[PDB]
Amino acid sequence: GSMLDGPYQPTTFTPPSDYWILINSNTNGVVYESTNNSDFWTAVIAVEPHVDPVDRQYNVFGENKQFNVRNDSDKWKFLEMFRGSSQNDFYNRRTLTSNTRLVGILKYGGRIWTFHGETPRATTDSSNTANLNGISITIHSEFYIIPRSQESKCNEYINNGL
Ligand SMILES: CC(=O)N[C@@H]1[C@@H](O[C@@H]2O[C@H](CO)[C@H](O)[C@H](O)[C@H]2O)[C@H](O)[C@@H](CO)O[C@H]1O
């Protein structure tokens, strides 16, 4: 179809390897939840502009959790909350401060890639897993699909907008 394929409505699916999923967050709270139920749990939480430090509730992987959040920018903030085993408390692994409200997740090269840092200079980073194929995602906002070969385009969107 189009190289920027979408938008698609919120759903749950197992992303194929080699394709960036670009999610256009349009509200606060949980953007997506992704797990293989074995060694990888990531949830992305959206925090609106100028939020003083506070503990908010988020339902993730079916359970209500309290996360400490803040955002001292005009830009939107996206926190990666992770755990690698079912018994561990989630920790804030990475952040993305963004004027464009776009977050990205990719299966490639054996590991999960996401964007982090601050637009317009956000960059990618990897996360290891021993069960990449098992990782599914529940996405709560509209999203697009872009091949990994076209990451330069994905990077422009993340940093500069659609
Ligand atoms: C060195 C390399 O090829 N790394 C790949 C990643 O792409 C790089 O991403 C940085 C930002 O993090 C720069 O844009 C650099 O030019 C890119 O080469 C890529 O994000 C991941 C996932 O597709 O694959 C790495 O191999």
Residue numbers in the entry: 225 to 386
Sentences from the paper on this structure:
Diverse interactions between histo-blood group antigens (HBGAs) and rotavirus have been described and it is believed that HBGAs expressed on the surface of target cells serve as viral receptors. The distal VP8* portion (~27 kDa, N-terminal) of the rotavirus spike protein VP4 from P, P, P and P genotypes recognize the secretor HBGAs. To understand the molecular basis of LNB and H1 recognition and binding to P VP8* we determined the crystal structure of the clinical isolate Pc VP8* in its apo form and bound to LNB and H1 glycans.
Crystals of Pc VP8* bound to H1 or its precursor LNB were obtained in a third different crystalline form and the structures of Pc VP8*-H1 and Pc VP8*-LNB complexes were solved to 1.8 and 1.3 Å, respectively. Two protomers of VP8* were present in the ASU of each of these crystals and, remarkably, only one out of the two protomers showed a bound glycan molecule. Sugar binding induces negligible conformational changes in the VP8* since the structural comparison of the glycan-bounded and glycan-free Pc VP8* protomers showed minimal differences (RMSD 0.22–0.35 Å). Only seven residues recognize the LNB, contacting the N-acetyl-glucosamine moiety via L167, W174, T185, R209, and E212 and the galactose moiety via T184, T185, E212 and N216. The N-acetyl-glucosamine has a major contribution to the binding since it is inserted in the pocket while the galactose acquires a more superficial position. A close view of the relative disposition of the precursor LNB moiety in both Pc VP8* complexes after superimposition of VP8* proteins showed some differences but not so for the interacting residues. If, alternatively, the N-acetyl-glucosamine moieties from both structures are superimposed it becomes visible that the galactose moiety occupies a more solvent-exposed position in the LNB structure compared to H1, explaining its weaker binding in comparison with this antigen. The atomic resolution of the diffraction data and the high quality of the density maps derived from these data allows modeling accurately the ligand structures to observe these differences.
